[PDB]
Amino acid sequence: TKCTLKSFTVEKGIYQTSNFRVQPTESIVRFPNITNLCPFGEVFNATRFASVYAWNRKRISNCVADYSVLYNSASFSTFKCYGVSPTKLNDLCFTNVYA
Amino acid sequence: YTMSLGAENSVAYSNNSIAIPTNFTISVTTEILPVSMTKTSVDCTMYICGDSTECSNLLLQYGSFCTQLNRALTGIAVEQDKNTQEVFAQVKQIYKTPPIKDFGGFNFSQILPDPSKPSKRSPIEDLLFNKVTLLICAQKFNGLTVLPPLLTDEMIAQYTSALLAGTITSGWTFGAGPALQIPFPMQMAYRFNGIGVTQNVLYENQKLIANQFNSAIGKIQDSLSSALGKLQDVVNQNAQALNTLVKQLSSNFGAISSVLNDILSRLDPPEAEVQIDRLITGRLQSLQTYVTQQLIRAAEIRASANLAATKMSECVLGQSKRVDFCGKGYHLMSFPQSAPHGVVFLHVTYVPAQEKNFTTAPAICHDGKAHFPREGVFVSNGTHWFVTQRNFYEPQIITTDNTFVSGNCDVVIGIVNNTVYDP
Amino acid sequence: ALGKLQDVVNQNAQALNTLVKQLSSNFGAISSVLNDILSRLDPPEAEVQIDRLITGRLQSLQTYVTQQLIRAAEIRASANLAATKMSECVLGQSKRVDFCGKGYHLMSFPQSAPHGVVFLHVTYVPAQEKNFTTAPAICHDGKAHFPREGVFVSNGTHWFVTQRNFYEPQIITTDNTFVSGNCDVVIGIVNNTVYDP
Amino acid sequence: TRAGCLIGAEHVNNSYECDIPIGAGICASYQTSQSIIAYTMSLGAENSVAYSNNSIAIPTNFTISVTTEILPVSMTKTSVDCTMYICG
Amino acid sequence: LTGTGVLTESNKKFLPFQQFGRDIADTTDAVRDPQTLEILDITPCSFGGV
C-alpha cells in the first residue's frame, strides 16, 4: 500500500494493488510427428538448374523441416529471412512451403 | 409533415372577465431521474499487456498514465457511491408504517412495500425493476471488472420506505426536525392550505379526493406495466462503451498482429519492440478515450443526481411552491421510488379541471369607501355580487371582515356599487 | 472538517506533480533529457527521439488539460450552487426544504474561505413533543367551524386552538375560526362550544 | 461475500455506522483485543411513529441550531507554456 | 501458437475441416488437438482483483 501510494503515513480507506495471478509451471507442446524428411540435398545441390524467367517450383509438405543440415554442407553467401526470426523456425509450424 | 405545436386556442380575454374553477382533479405524475451507474474499473496490465513481461517492462515509461487512469476510475466509483448516498439518505432515522391502514380513505397499498414478497419492495418498484433489463466472465478475463455498489437494492428500498413512512405519518416535519405525527386528511388539507385552497374544501369532499388519488395511482400502475428510457440509455451507453473497449483489441494499429503472443511467436524483440510499442500507443489511446467519455458521463450523472437530491429534499420532505419543479400543477406531495441506478418520483399535483366565466370588479363601493378583498376575488353571477377564493367557486356574501377598506371610490377605474351586508 | 476545500487543492497540486513526473519518462526514447539527446546525437538521426518525446509530453499535457477542464466544470457547478445559496439563503429567507440547512431556515452567514465559501445557516429546529387528541373541525350548534391558520388540540378536558409549530393554547373563538357549511359533511368532527364574547 | 473474499477481518452479528466502505452493504472498522471487524451497515434508528386517526404532535420548546456547510468556489489559476514545458 | 490458461473438457464439437476457435475479443477459447482430435476449452487462470 505504501509502495502503490508513495507515502509512509497511509490514511484509512480503500486502495488497489496488483491482482492475484497464478504462475504456470509446465508447458505442453502439441505437434503432429512425421517420420518422413523434407528434401534439402537435391534442392540445395542439384545437377542442373533452370533460368530466372522459367523458375523451378517445388512444393514441400508432410515432412519435418530442419535447417541444421545447411550449416555443414556448403558455405552460403547470403542467408536472409524477412518477417520471421531465423532461430524461431522450430518454435512455429510451417504452412505452404514453396521453393 | 411540418410538425404542429399542439392545440390552437385563444383565451377570451376581457377587462372584467374571470375564470374560477368549480371542480378539480388530483393527478399524480411520474418523473424518471438517474442517480448512479455501473462502477467499472479498468486495470492497464490485463487490458493492454495481459500476461506479458516485456509489455510490463515497456509500460513503465507510461506508468503515471495508468496511475492517472486508475485514479480516475476510482474517483468515478466513489463519486457514484457519494451520489447514491446523497440521494437516498435525507433522514438518519428509519421510519415504519403502522399496521393500522385507516388513512382517511386514502389507499396506501401499492407504494408501500409488501411483506408477503421475498423482496422488500412495493409492486410499483417490482414492475419498475422488471422493466429495465441489465459476457460477464468474457469481459472480466480481459481485465474489465465491475465493482458492486455500496448501498444494495434492499438498502435503497429500506431508505425509500423510511422516507415514505415519514411522508405519510409526518409529511414535512420529519424533514426539518423530529417526526411529528399528524393524520393524513389534515396533512393533505395542509398541503391544500400551502397553495391557497382552504381546508374546508378538502373536508367537504374527502372521499372524492381519496378516490381520485387511488384511481390515479391505479392509472400509474396500469400505465407503467404496459417508459423508463431515462434509466435505459445510461446502461446502454455504459455497456456500449465497454463493448467498444472489447472490440478495441482486434485492431492491428499498423502492426502485423493484434495478439501479443502471436507477435512473440514470430518475432525477435529487436524487430518486435516498435510494433509492440505501436500497440501500446493504440491501446492507451483507446483507454484515454474511454476515460474521457466516462468522465463526461460521470459529470452528467452527477448533475442529474444533484437534481435528484434537490428534488427529493424539496418535493418529498416538503411542499414546494416552485412551479413545474415537482410535477405539472400546484404541488401537494411527492413519493420516491427505488429504481435500477436511479430514482422515480410520483408527484401528486393539484390541477383544476372545470371553469366558468365570471364578471368581476377589483373593488366595490359601499358608502364612498372602496372595499378590497383580503384573500379572494369579487365575482358575479349576473345579479348578485359574491366573493370567492382563487381556485374554487364558494359563494360567500360581501361581509366587512372578508374585505378591507382603502380610501374613497373615485381613484379606481374599475369599481362597482354593491352593498356590503355589514352584519 | 474542511475536506471539500482540501481535496481541490490536493487534486490540483497532485496533478501538477503528475505533470512534473511526466517529464522524467522516456516514452520509447534513449533518454528523457533533450540536452542529453542533442549531446549524444547529430540532428539528422535525433528527430525520431525528439518527436517521440514531443508526442509523449504532448499526450500528458492534453491529459492534464482534459482533467483540468472537467474539474473546472465541477468547480463551476459547485460555485453556481454557492452563488445561488448566497443569493437565496443569505439575501432573503428561503422556504426551500433542506437547501439552507437542516430545519426551517431563518438566515445564513457566509464566511470567507481559501478558494471557497463557508455558510453558517441558522435553522429553526423544533424540540419536545406532547400528544394531543385533535379534530379537523368543531360543531357549535349545527355550523362547522374550521381553523384559520392553526390546528385544534385538546388536553383531554377542553378543546383549544394552537398553531402547528409551537404550542400556545388559545380559547376557540369565532374570530380565529371560519364557518363553512353544516357539520354532517366532515367525517371527523366534535361538538364543542364557542364562548362568543 | 458478494463484494469478495475478505481475509484479516472478523464478522460480527451487530450493525454499526459505516466507517470504511467495502461494497454490497458491508463496511469495515477498527474498534471491536482490538482487530478489524466486518459488518453489514446500519441505516439509523429502528422505530415507528405513533400514528392515529386523531393524534397530533405539537412542539412546546425549540432549539435554534447553527449548522455549517462548506462549498468550493475557486481553484488555483495555473498556466502552462509549451516552449518551457516540452522544450527548453 | 503459445498461450496460458486452464485446459478443460468441452461439449461443443467442431467441424472436420475446422481446427481453430476464437471469440468476441479474439482470444483462443477452444482448440483442436492434432493427435487425440478432442475439443478442449481454454479458460485463463487470471481471474481476480486485490
Contact yes or no for B165 and D49 at CB 8 A: yes
Contact between B336 and B348 (Cβ < 8 Å) = no
Contact between C122 and C106 (Cβ < 8 Å) = yes
Contact between C124 and C106 (Cβ < 8 Å) = yes
E abuts A (3+ Cβ pairs < 8 Å)? yes
Angstrom distance (rounded) from CA B25 to CA B212: 7
Partners of D41 on chain B (C-beta within 8 Å) are 155
Contact yes or no for D22 and A13 at CB 8 A: no
Cell triple for D34: 482490538
Contact between B188 and B213 (Cβ < 8 Å) = no
In chain C, which among 131-170 make CB contacts under 8 A with chain B?
131, 134, 136-137, 144, 146-147, 151, 164
In chain D, which among 9-68 make CB contacts under 8 A with chain B?
21, 23-25, 41, 43-59
Q: Which residue has the cell 528434401?
A: A39
Separation in Å, CA C112 to CA A40, C102, D73: 89, 22, 10
Q: Kindly provide the residue ranges of all beta strands, DSSP E only, lying in B139-191, ordered along the sequence.
A: 144-147
Shortest CA gap E44–chain A (Å) = 10
Contact yes or no for C22 and B64 at CB 8 A: yes
Side-chain-side CA neighbours of B152 within 13 Å: the count stands at 18
Separation in Å, CA C99 to CA B182, B317, C78, C144: 24, 11, 14, 39
CB pairs under 8 A between B and E: 34
Strands B415-417 and B403-405 turn out to be unpaired
Q: Which amino acid, C196?
A: D
Contact yes or no for C96 and B320 at CB 8 A: yes
B79 in contact with A at a CB cutoff of 8 Å?
A: no
Which ranges of chain D would DSSP assign to H, the alpha helix?
A: 82-85
What element of type H or E holds C177? strand C177-179
Partners of B74 on chain A (C-beta within 8 Å) are 16
Partners of A12 on chain D (C-beta within 8 Å) are 19-20
Quick one: closest CA in C to D83, which residue? C54
Contact yes or no for C115 and D80 at CB 8 A: no
Three-class secondary structure of residue C150 per DSSP? coil
What element of type H or E holds C124? strand C116-127
Question: Who among C13, C85, C164 is closest to D58 (CB)?
Answer: C164
Q: Who contacts B271 (Cβ-Cβ below 8 Å, separation ≥6)?
A: A85
Entry resolution in angstroms? 3.1
Shortest CA gap A63–chain D (Å) = 52
Question: Who among B92, B97, B180 is closest to D57 (CB)?
Answer: B180
- Method by which the model was determined: cryo-EM
Quick one: closest CA in E to A16, which residue? E50
Angstrom distance (rounded) from CA B321 to CA B350: 12
- At residue D48, φ and ψ (nearest 5 deg) are -115, 150
CB pairs under 8 A between A and B: 23
Question: Who among A18, A19, A92 is closest to B266 (CB)?
Answer: A92
Partners of B246 on chain E (C-beta within 8 Å) are 24-25
Angstrom distance (rounded) from CA B276 to CA B167: 61
C101-137 residues labelled b (16+ CB within 10 A) or e (exposed): bbbbbbbbeeeebebbbbbbbbbbbbeebeebebbbb
A92 in contact with B at a CB cutoff of 8 Å?
A: yes
Longest dimension (CA), chain A: 82
Partners of E33 on chain A (C-beta within 8 Å) are 30
Find how far residue B339's CA is from the centre of its chain.
Answer: 11
Partners of B49 on chain A (C-beta within 8 Å) are none
Angstrom distance (rounded) from CA C127 to CA B178: 7
* C-alpha R_g of chain E: 12
Find how far residue D64's CA is from the centre of its chain.
Answer: 26
Contact between B261 and E1 (Cβ < 8 Å) = yes
The C-alpha torsion from B316 through C147 and B192 to B187, rounded to 10°, is 30
Three-class secondary structure of residue B124 per DSSP? helix
Strands B356-360 and B17-20 turn out to be antiparallel
Angstrom distance (rounded) from CA B317 to CA B90: 8
Q: Who contacts B55 (Cβ-Cβ below 8 Å, separation ≥6)?
A: B48, B49, B260, B276, B280
Please provide the distance, in angstroms rounded to a whole number, between the alpha carbons at the two ends of chain C.
59
What element of type H or E holds B343? strand B342-352
Question: Who among C82, C125, C151 is closest to D65 (CB)?
Answer: C125
One-letter-per-residue 3-state SS of chain A:
CHHHHCCCCCCCCCCCCCCCCCCCCCCCCCCCCCCCECCCHHHHCCCCCCCCCCCCCCEECCCECCCCCHHHHCCCCCCCCCCCCCCCCCCCCCCCEEC
Shortest CA gap C111–chain B (Å) = 24
Side-chain-side CA neighbours of B314 within 13 Å: the count stands at 20
Cell triple for D47: 422505530
- In 3D space, the residue among B147, B126, B85 whose CA is nearest the CA of residue D41 turns out to be B85
Strands D10-11 and D37-40 turn out to be parallel
Separation in Å, CA C123 to CA A26, B261, C101, C126, D64: 71, 66, 6, 10, 6
Partners of D51 on chain B (C-beta within 8 Å) are 98, 100, 168-169, 181, 183
Cell triple for E46: 487470471
Three-class secondary structure of residue B359 per DSSP? strand
Q: Who contacts B42 (Cβ-Cβ below 8 Å, separation ≥6)?
A: B69, B70, B73, B143, B144, B145, B245, B287, B290
Contact yes or no for D59 and B148 at CB 8 A: no
